[PDB]
Amino acid sequence: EEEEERRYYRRKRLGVLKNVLAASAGGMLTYGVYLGLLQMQLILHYDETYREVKYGNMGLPDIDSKMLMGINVTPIAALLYTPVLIRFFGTKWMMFLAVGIYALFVSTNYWERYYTLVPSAVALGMAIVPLWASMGNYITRMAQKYHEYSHYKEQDGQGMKQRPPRGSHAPYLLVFQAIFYSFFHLSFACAQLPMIYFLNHYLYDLNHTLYNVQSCGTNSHGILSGFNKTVLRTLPRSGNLIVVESVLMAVAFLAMLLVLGLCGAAYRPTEEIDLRSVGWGNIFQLPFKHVRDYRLRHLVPFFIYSGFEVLFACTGIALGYGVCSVGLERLAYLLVAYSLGASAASLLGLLGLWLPRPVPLVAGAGVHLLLTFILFFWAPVPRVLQHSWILYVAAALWGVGSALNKTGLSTLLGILYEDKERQDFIFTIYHWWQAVAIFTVYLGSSLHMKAKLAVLLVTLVAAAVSYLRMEQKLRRGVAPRQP
Amino acid sequence: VSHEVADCSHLKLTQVPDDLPTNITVLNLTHNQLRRLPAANFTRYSQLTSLDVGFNTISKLEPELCQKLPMLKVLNLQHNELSQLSDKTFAFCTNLTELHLMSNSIQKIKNNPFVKQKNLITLDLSHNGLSSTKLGTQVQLENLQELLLSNNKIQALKSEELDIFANSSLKKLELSSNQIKEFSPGCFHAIGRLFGLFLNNVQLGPSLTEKLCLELANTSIRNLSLSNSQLSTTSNTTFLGLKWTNLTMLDLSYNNLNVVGNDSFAWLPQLEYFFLEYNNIQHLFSHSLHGLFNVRYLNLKRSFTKQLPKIDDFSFQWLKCLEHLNMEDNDIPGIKSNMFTGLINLKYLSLSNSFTSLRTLTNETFVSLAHSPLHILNLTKNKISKIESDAFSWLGHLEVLDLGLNEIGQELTGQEWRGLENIFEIYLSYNKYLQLTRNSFALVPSLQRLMLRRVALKNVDSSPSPFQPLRNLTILDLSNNNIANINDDMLEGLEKLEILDLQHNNLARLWKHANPGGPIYFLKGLSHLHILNLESNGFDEIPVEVFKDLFELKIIDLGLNNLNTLPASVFNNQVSLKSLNLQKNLITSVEKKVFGPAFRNLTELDMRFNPFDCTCESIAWFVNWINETHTNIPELSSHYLCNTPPHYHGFPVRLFDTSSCKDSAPFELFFMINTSILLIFIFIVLLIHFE
Numbered sequence A: 001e002e003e004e005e006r007r008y009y010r011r012k013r014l015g016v017l018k019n020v021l022a023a024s025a026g027g028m029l030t031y032g033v034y035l036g037l038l039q040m041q042l043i044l045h046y047d048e049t050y051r052e053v054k055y056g057n058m059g060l061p062d063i064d065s066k067m068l069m070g071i072n073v074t075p076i077a078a079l080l081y082t083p084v085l086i087r088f089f090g091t092k093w094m095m096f097l098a099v100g101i102y103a104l105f106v107s108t109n110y111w112e113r114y115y116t117l118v119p120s121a122v123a124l125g126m127a128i129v130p131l132w133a134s135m136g137n138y139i140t141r142m143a144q145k146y147h148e149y150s151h152y153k154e155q156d157g158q159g160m161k162q163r164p165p166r167g168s169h170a171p172y173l174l175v176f177q178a179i180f181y182s183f184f185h186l187s188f189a190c191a192q193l194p195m196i197y198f199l200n201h202y203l204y205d206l207n208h209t210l211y212n213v214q215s216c217g218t219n220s221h222g223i224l225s226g227f228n229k230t231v232l233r234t235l236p237r238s239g240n241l242i243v244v245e246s247v248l249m250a251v252a253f254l255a256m257l258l259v260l261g262l263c264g265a266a267y268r269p270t271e272e273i274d275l276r277s278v279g280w281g282n283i284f285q286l287p288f289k290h291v292r293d294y295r296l297r298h299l300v301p302f303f304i305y306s307g308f309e310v311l312f313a314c315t316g317i318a319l320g321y322g323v324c325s326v327g328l329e330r331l332a333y334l335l336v337a338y339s340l341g342a343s344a345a346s347l348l349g350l351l352g353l354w355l356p357r358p359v360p361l362v363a364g365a366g367v368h369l370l371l372t373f374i375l376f377f378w379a380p381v382p383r384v385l386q387h388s389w390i391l392y393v394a395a396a397l398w399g400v401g402s403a404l405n406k407t408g409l410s411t412l413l414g415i416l417y418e419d420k421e422r423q424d425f426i427f428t429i430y431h432w433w434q435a436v437a438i439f440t441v442y443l444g445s446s447l448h449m450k451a452k453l454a455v456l457l458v459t460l461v462a463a464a465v466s467y468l469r470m471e472q473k474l475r476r477g478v479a480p481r482q483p
Numbered sequence B: 001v002s003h004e005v006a007d008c009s010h011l012k013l014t015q016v017p018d019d020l021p022t023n024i025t026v027l028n029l030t031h032n033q034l035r036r037l038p039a040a041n042f043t044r045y046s047q048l049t050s051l052d053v054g055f056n057t058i059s060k061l062e063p064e065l066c067q068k069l070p071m072l073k074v075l076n077l078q079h080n081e082l083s084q085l086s087d088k089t090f091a092f093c094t095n096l097t098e099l100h101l102m103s104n105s106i107q108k109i110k111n112n113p114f115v116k117q118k119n120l121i122t123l124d125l126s127h128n129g130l131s132s133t134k135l136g137t138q139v140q141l142e143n144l145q146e147l148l149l150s151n152n153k154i155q156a157l158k159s160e161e162l163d164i165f166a167n168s169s170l171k172k173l174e175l176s177s178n179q180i181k182e183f184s185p186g187c188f189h190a191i192g193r194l195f196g197l198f199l200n201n202v203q204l205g206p207s208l209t210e211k212l213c214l215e216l217a218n219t220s221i222r223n224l225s226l227s228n229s230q231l232s233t234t235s236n237t238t239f240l241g242l243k244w245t246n247l248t249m250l251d252l253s254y255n256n257l258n259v260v261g262n263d264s265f266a267w268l269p270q271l272e273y274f275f276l277e278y279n280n281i282q283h284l285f286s287h288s289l290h291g292l293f294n295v296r297y298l299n300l301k302r303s304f305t306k307q308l309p310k311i312d313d314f315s316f317q318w319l320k321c322l323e324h325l326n327m328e329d330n331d332i333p334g335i336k337s338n339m340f341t342g343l344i345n346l347k348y349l350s351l352s353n354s355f356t357s358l359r360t361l362t363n364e365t366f367v368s369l370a371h372s373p374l375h376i377l378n379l380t381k382n383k384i385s386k387i388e389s390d391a392f393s394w395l396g397h398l399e400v401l402d403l404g405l406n407e408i409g410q411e412l413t414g415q416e417w418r419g420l421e422n423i424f425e426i427y428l429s430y431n432k433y434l435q436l437t438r439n440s441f442a443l444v445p446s447l448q449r450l451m452l453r454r455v456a457l458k459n460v461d462s463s464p465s466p467f468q469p470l471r472n473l474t475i476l477d478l479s480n481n482n483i484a485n486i487n488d489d490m491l492e493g494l495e496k497l498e499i500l501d502l503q504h505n506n507l508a509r510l511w512k513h514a515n516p517g518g519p520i521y522f523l524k525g526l527s528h529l530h531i532l533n534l535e536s537n538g539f540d541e542i543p544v545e546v547f548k549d550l551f552e553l554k555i556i557d558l559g560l561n562n563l564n565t566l567p568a569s570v571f572n573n574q575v576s577l578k579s580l581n582l583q584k585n586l587i588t589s590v591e592k593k594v595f596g597p598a599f600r601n602l603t604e605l606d607m608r609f610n611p612f613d614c615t616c617e618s619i620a621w622f623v624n625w626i627n628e629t630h631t632n633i634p635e636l637s638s639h640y641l642c643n644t645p646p647h648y649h650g651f652p653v654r655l656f657d658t659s660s661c662k663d664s665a666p667f668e669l670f671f672m673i674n675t676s677i678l679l680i681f682i683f684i685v686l687l688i689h690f691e
């Protein structure tokens, strides 16, 4: 007989596919909830009306400052406690712990005080990096399992008992990462749902909140130099706020429970004891031992650029250029347009499979580069509503470049390293460098302009990727070996 | 609008309404345009008792009107146009009791139109144009008591026109503002009983007054008003016939009595009330008020000339039963040694602005009141500046003494209040200056009220209490004096003090915590305190244990101060608080911790012109309490505004919505339950996984 094992392997592949889809859906849902709550608290705490009526003598700006700090400075220390961590619970249970920490941070948003927001902010900061690490490890490992199952089904005796694919899991990793980042960038549009359905109708017209804005664009001189003290025409009723926050808690709990249940178990105890054969006294320094890797010294600027560009797409274009001609009424639509652009670019890069590996990457490194030029000469006048599609198309192209670069880097880092521990350490280093980039943008706020730094960093990444390819073709044969 | 009355005044109606309910009994059609009163339109109303159509314009009155009103008692025709009157006007209607016919241009009476009202009590024909007092041809008006014929053109009185009142008792005969120049013999004798007689603003003179006085022989007249009669000089033969009467009241005011001869009132042995206000007496003779040994009320207000009148000694020796002597608003030069001698039954004497220059008050001033049981003494606006010792020793029964509205400036040594054993009230407000002394009020232990408003009181910060012997003091007023040195040992033992006013002072630096010695506590011991006032002093801080013994505190006043924050537990002892006044302050927040027991049973609240912050955390409970309560806050929609934040600047507090605050929705309980279930779920799933 042979049809029973055929159907068996079919069910295993279907389970792998649905588990990847559920993990992606839960990640995007929890990230959208987090972004929406953060945006709602940033807009609701930037007015003397709300801050003085509801809180008054509470030191709310201090609360926001300490929260932003504990969110942006903690991820660094995450490196000091993420490897063993992701090897303690597992590759999937750390994802659940991270989404639970996110749900806890959302829960502490109700009463809103110091001793309840500061610890939740520290937990979110220390979990934002292991979340991405375990997420990438899970996606890559499940793509590898799908590929090995397909190969063992189509080739029973041809596949050798150890290390089947031999660099042939790219067509199965790319099609997974594409839909994964499609969902992750659709999360950006999903995060703007509460602000659209509740907050976008409570702020008055841009004629008064954008009054003392003398110049913007290339002459920003900060995140928001000129702006009004208040933004809401009427103070939101407590009932609408509590129902919105309860809906947010409900959808976050739904995401967390679908991550828990619709994942099964993809760890097995054999690999557990295999990795425990290494020990705890060595796992601390393997991410520090991998600094001798040749490919990392040329890819660290890529991670720094990824962090800088996601922070620019989050704040630089929306709060630096999108706030000029139009106020907070069309910022949500701007973010949704950026999200749809990135989601379309995800499948656009998915189409780029027949071409070799380092083709779309630098391609993205060009397109937004052009936008950088557009972000260096063109400066929109704030007190005029003549051109409104230029911002939309600029955000669309920026999201296109962002999605292309991110997906390409993900597939590249998944292809260059196939061993499980290698994927773990490499994703850890990638996400720690991304967190360092985010922390630098946090410190890089309220300066003159950050477009020159962006263009120089993109040029550096382009040169580094070209160097990496040119030395990888002529065969170096350099790789660290610390079992 | 219609509660047993028909209010139609200032509403402008031309015809009588026919839509008012039939249960009405009083109408009021004044200031309207009523022209006629048809009897057919009044068929619906029959239980009427009071009718008022005054201040209108009606030519003739419909004669058959009263036929359908068998209960009509009040009928008013004020300011109407009924000149000629007919006999058939009131013929078959006899239940009428009042009749007002003021301002009607009535010229003359032809044939007894007022003959079929056997129940008429009050009849008025004033403001008319009658030239004779003839109202009938036979005996009529058996129960008439008031007949007002004033403001007419009557030239002379005859018995042939008054013989119709032979079987009646005219309680009041208003003949004021007339030109009576002749009194026919026996004119007043035609009336059965004549009680009141009002001839005001009538040009009489000495001769006419003597003729009127001699005509009233064998008459039962009780009151006689001759005000504004221009009576210049009287003699002992003027009120000659008055000895054949029982007159008890006499009004000789506004007549400019220049000279009053001796024994001018010797023929009034039973007179009880005598009025002499507003005259021009040049010299009050010695034997002027002779024979008035029964008058118990004398009014000499403005009786003497302005700018000087002469008063001889023993001028009131014959006023034995004088129980009320009022001589205010005059220019007596000074009090003689035997001016008020012979007043054995006096109980009231008012001397407000009665002297030109009464500077010093020696011990020999009120010697004429040694045998007088005076009870109320009024000495105001007399320019009093100095009071010597033993100035009131001759007044043992004096209870209420007043020296206010003067320029009194001396150091109260306590020797001036000697001889006041039964003193109860002392009024010393609106003076120059009084310096207190250790034994200032030691000779008046029976005191119960002390007013010291606007005196600029000093020397109060003595080591002992100046009000210590005032163990029976109930009301104290030390306001408008700009005092700044008050000790804590000032109001001990005064556990019956009920009213205390301390406004317009400088008690700000005494309640502060930064002064040497600490905040002063001068409100201790006062248990029966009821009224309190500390308005316009500039207060900044309030102690916590200052309102300890103020149990029965009803009304308090802390307005016009510089208060911004109030400490906690400062109204806990206000178990009977009724009113609160915190206007013109700098109060921002109203919290439960400091306005808790104050807003329990408060009646009238006043916090006008206060800069409240339009924040929920500060005034949430305040707005919730203003939402529903029984305390009335006057002028709340236009005087209770907000200053900060600028978004709510100039916004009334009544429009503040408390549905958006930290206690509107229970998100704290939601946070607790969510965090708990999340932590328990995480712990249990880690336990299941680790097994």
Ligand SMILES: *[C@@H]1O[C@H](CO)[C@@H](O[C@@H]2O[C@H](CO)[C@@H](O[C@@H]3O[C@H](CO)[C@@H](O)[C@H](O)[C@@H]3O)[C@H](O)[C@H]2NC(C)=O)[C@H](O)[C@H]1NC(C)=O
Pocket: B218, B219, B220, B221, B244, B245, B246
């Ligand atoms: C002023 O008042 C005096 C005192 O009341 C009046 O004198 C009194 O007049 C009445 C009525 O005539 C006298 O009553 C009569 O007494 C006699 C006995 O003498 C008796 O037979 C009668 O049947 C009737 O009761 C009363 O005695 C008399 N009293 C005195 C002390 O004289 C006087 O009439 C009054 N005058 C006026 C004008 O009102």
Ligand SMILES: *[C@@H]1O[C@H](CO)[C@@H](O[C@@H]2O[C@H](CO)[C@@H](O[C@@H]3O[C@H](CO)[C@@H](O)[C@H](O)[C@@H]3O)[C@H](O)[C@H]2NC(C)=O)[C@H](O)[C@H]1NC(C)=O
Pocket: B363, B364, B390
């Ligand atoms: C009201 O007060 C005045 C002033 O205090 C009193 O007048 C005083 O009367 C006594 C008694 O005559 C006078 O005493 C006299 O002293 C002289 C020596 O200075 C002596 O020679 C005489 O024999 C007599 O004792 C006193 O001088 C006098 N005071 C003044 C300022 O003249 C008056 O007695 C008081 N009246 C009452 C009713 O209390």
Ligand SMILES: *[C@@H]1O[C@H](CO)[C@@H](O[C@@H]2O[C@H](CO)[C@@H](O)[C@H](O)[C@H]2NC(C)=O)[C@H](O)[C@H]1NC(C)=O
Pocket: A208, A209, A211, A212, A227, A228, A229, A230
């Ligand atoms: C924020 O906006 C408010 C109005 O939306 C501005 O207030 C105005 O200020 C000018 C300057 O004195 C006044 O002439 C106007 O009457 C004000 N408008 C009002 C009171 O409605 C305020 O200046 C703005 N501030 C900033 C920093 O942008």
Ligand SMILES: *[C@@H]1O[C@H](CO)[C@@H](O[C@@H]2O[C@H](CO)[C@@H](O)[C@H](O)[C@H]2NC(C)=O)[C@H](O)[C@H]1NC(C)=O
Pocket: B217, B218, B244
């Ligand atoms: C009404 O008053 C006159 C005024 O005195 C009284 O007339 C006196 O009457 C007595 C007794 O007849 C005489 O002795 C007097 O000489 C009369 N006085 C005169 C004429 O001036 C008269 O008595 C009084 N009427 C009554 C009823 O007593």
Ligand SMILES: *[C@@H]1O[C@H](CO)[C@@H](O[C@@H]2O[C@H](CO)[C@@H](O)[C@H](O)[C@H]2NC(C)=O)[C@H](O)[C@H]1NC(C)=O
Pocket: B171, B172, B195, B196, B222, B223, B249, B273
């Ligand atoms: C005559 O004058 C006296 C003195 O005013 C009147 O007696 C007072 O009348 C008023 C009005 O009814 C009362 O309120 C007072 O109590 C009376 N004073 C008393 C009785 O001592 C008297 O009413 C007048 N008589 C007439 C007929 O008008």
Ligand SMILES: *[C@@H]1O[C@H](CO)[C@@H](O[C@@H]2O[C@H](CO)[C@@H](O)[C@H](O)[C@H]2NC(C)=O)[C@H](O)[C@H]1NC(C)=O
Pocket: B350, B352, B376, B378, B379, B380, B400, B401, B402
């Ligand atoms: C002494 O006389 C004065 C003047 O008549 C009295 O002052 C009046 O008091 C009444 C009572 O409240 C007020 O309604 C008036 O307005 C006051 N008039 C003035 C001009 O001040 C004073 O009350 C009298 N004192 C006593 C003890 O009777």
Ligand SMILES: *[C@@H]1O[C@H](CO)[C@@H](O[C@@H]2O[C@H](CO)[C@@H](O)[C@H](O)[C@H]2NC(C)=O)[C@H](O)[C@H]1NC(C)=O
Pocket: B445, B446, B447, B472
């Ligand atoms: C203070 O007030 C009290 C209470 O009214 C007075 O005590 C009364 O005095 C009278 C006068 O002899 C007695 O008839 C009462 O029996 C007393 N009653 C009580 C309860 O003691 C007291 O005399 C007043 N003090 C002064 C100095 O007048």
Ligand SMILES: *[C@@H]1O[C@H](CO)[C@@H](O)[C@H](O)[C@H]1NC(C)=O
Pocket: A207, A385
């Ligand atoms: C409000 O904004 C619109 C946007 O174009 C503008 O046309 C209008 O003049 C503004 N109203 C003002 C400035 O009063």
Ligand SMILES: *[C@@H]1O[C@H](CO)[C@@H](O)[C@H](O)[C@H]1NC(C)=O
Pocket: B015, B016, B017, B018, B038, B040, B041
């Ligand atoms: C009765 O009163 C009504 C109400 O105004 C009026 O219309 C009507 O003319 C009156 N009747 C007579 C006869 O005046």
Ligand SMILES: *[C@@H]1O[C@H](CO)[C@@H](O)[C@H](O)[C@H]1NC(C)=O
Pocket: B004, B021, B023, B024
């Ligand atoms: C009419 O007046 C009488 C007496 O005041 C009262 O009892 C009755 O209720 C009134 N009618 C109406 C309809 O109110």
Ligand SMILES: *[C@@H]1O[C@H](CO)[C@@H](O)[C@H](O)[C@H]1NC(C)=O
Pocket: B009, B026, B027, B028, B030, B050, B051, B052, B076
């Ligand atoms: C009618 O009303 C006026 C104004 O209120 C009042 O002065 C007058 O006494 C009233 N008349 C009657 C008879 O009620």
Ligand SMILES: *[C@@H]1O[C@H](CO)[C@@H](O)[C@H](O)[C@H]1NC(C)=O
Pocket: B070, B071, B093, B094, B095
């Ligand atoms: C007058 O009043 C009496 C009793 O108040 C009553 O019996 C009578 O009907 C009324 N009307 C007339 C015309 O007497």
Ligand SMILES: *[C@@H]1O[C@H](CO)[C@@H](O)[C@H](O)[C@H]1NC(C)=O
Pocket: B139, B166, B167
């Ligand atoms: C008036 O009074 C006299 C005396 O009592 C009496 O005889 C007469 O009948 C009375 N007049 C009338 C109309 O009753």
Ligand SMILES: *[C@@H]1O[C@H](CO)[C@@H](O)[C@H](O)[C@H]1NC(C)=O
Pocket: B236, B237, B240
């Ligand atoms: C009034 O006094 C004069 C002067 O002594 C005297 O001649 C006359 O008789 C007196 N008249 C009366 C009625 O007392």
Ligand SMILES: *[C@@H]1O[C@H](CO)[C@@H](O)[C@H](O)[C@H]1NC(C)=O
Pocket: B260, B261, B262, B285, B286, B287
């Ligand atoms: C009143 O009597 C006094 C004292 O006998 C006397 O001086 C005065 O002239 C008399 N006046 C008249 C008008 O008789």
Ligand SMILES: *[C@@H]1O[C@H](CO)[C@@H](O)[C@H](O)[C@H]1NC(C)=O
Pocket: B626, B627, B628, B654
């Ligand atoms: C009390 O609050 C309710 C709810 O906002 C409102 O409908 C009502 O008008 C308020 N009443 C007063 C007297 O402010």
